[PDB]
Amino acid sequence: YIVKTFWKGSHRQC
Amino acid sequence: NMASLIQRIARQASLTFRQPGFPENLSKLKSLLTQLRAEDLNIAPRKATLQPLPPNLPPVTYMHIYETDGFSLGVFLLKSGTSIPLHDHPGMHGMLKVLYGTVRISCMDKLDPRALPPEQQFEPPLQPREREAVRPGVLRSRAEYTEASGPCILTPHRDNLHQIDAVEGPAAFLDILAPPYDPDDGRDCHYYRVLEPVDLPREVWLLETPQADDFWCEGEPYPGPKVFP
Ligand SMILES: [Cl-]
Ligand SMILES: [Co+2]
């Protein structure tokens, strides 16, 4: 899934 | 009384990243990061498992400590044999400090845009869409860093691309990003490949690439002293 993060931008967290 | 070192780091990061006064504030922030040790964050150094990494576990995890509109503050924890792939920090400054372990940090920049010469060949060969998309860059440095090294700095215009490899076991670093990434504001994290055609600094070829299938980062709880408003 994609999460907008402060620390890796639009990150695919999987 | 005396605030925790991580609270003082956050306070100083806020002052530095809200211009005259910036260099002096950045120097003070660097000096605070120089003093930081893993024990000041209640993070015990992690050592290798000597077992293969199962498919359901991330190669890297992240502990968030604090963020404001001006900066983000946290820790990345790399398992043995893992890398954070080559990536940029558009329009941002960054400061990192190794907490335990050894990392190899490769530092690069995109150059000005010049096109790939027609006869240039790569190994592995490039697909047609990749040949159109590759752009020139410069490899500025590639060195190993430990907790005894100073902090490493990047800026919007220098060492803005970096790759971080865990060397000879797990490693972790504190990272400050200023401002934080903001995809909705044109500040996303882009990944790149450096290509081998067929002495530093030296010119390289850079290809923007999707996040690798075997790289992702999951959060885990931060165990150290908390940063308070
Ligand atoms: Cl490990
Ligand atoms: Co980075």
Domains and CATH numbers, chain B: 5-44+58-106+139-192 (2.60.120.10)
Neighbours of ion ligand 1 (CB under 5 A): B 48-49, 79-80, 170
Which residues have a Cβ under 8 Å from the Cβ of B208 and sit 6 or more positions away? B133, B135, B190, B191, B192
Q: Which ranges constitute the DSSP H helices of B137-228?
A: none
CA angle B206/A10/B79 to nearest 5° reads: 75
- Please identify which residue in the block is written with the tokens 């044999």: B81
Method: X-ray
**Whole-number Å distance between alpha carbons of B199 and B28:** 33
B2 C-alpha vs ligand 2 centroid, how far in Å?
A: 31
Element (H, E) at B32: helix B22-35
Q: Which of B86, B174, B181, B188 to mutate to test the interface with A (most CBs of A within 10 A)?
A: B181
Which residues have a Cβ under 8 Å from the Cβ of B85 and sit 6 or more positions away? B163, B191, B192, B211, B212, B215
B165 C-alpha vs ligand 1 centroid, how far in Å?
A: 13
If you ran DSSP here, which 8-state letter would residue B227 be given? P
Kind of pairing between the strands at B93-110 and B161-178: antiparallel
Say yes or no for a CB contact (<8 Å) between B181 and A12.
no
Let me know: does B215 contact B84? Beta carbons within 8 Å.
Answer: yes
